[PDB]
Specification:
Blueprint lengths: L22 E6 L5 E3 L4 E6 L4 E5 L4 E6 L5 E3 L6 E3 L17
Antiparallel strand pairs: 1-3, 1-6, 2-5, 3-4, 5-7
Subcellular location: Mitochondrion matrix
Protein name: Methylcrotonoyl-CoA carboxylase subunit alpha, mitochondrial
Function: Biotin-attachment subunit of the 3-methylcrotonyl-CoA carboxylase, an enzyme that catalyzes the conversion of 3-methylcrotonyl-CoA to 3-methylglutaconyl-CoA, a critical step for leucine and isovaleric acid catabolism.
Amino acid sequence: GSSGSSGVSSQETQGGPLAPMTGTIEKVFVKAGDKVKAGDSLMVMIAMKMEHTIKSPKDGTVKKVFYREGAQANRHTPLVEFEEEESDKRESESGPSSG
C-alpha cells in the first residue's frame, strides 16, 4: 500500500505501523530511540484470543511508542512512530503523452 489512497484530507498515516484489528497489547518489544529491523517483532496484540505479532513494516529508529502492556488499540491505529527519515530519495519516471 503506497502511492495514492483516495478519500483523505491530508495523510491518514505516516511513519509508523497500524494495528490490524481491535485488540490488546500483550507484549511490547520496542521503545523510543530504539533500533529495529524490517520484519521485527515490535509488540504483541490480543484480539481473537490469538497472539498477533505486529511486525515492523520497515526499519528505523523508534521515535516513541503510544502503547504498552495491557493497552487497548483500535483497528488502524498508530502503535509506534518512526524517527524522521534521512538520506533517501525515491525514484520516478515520466514519458510523453499523445493526447
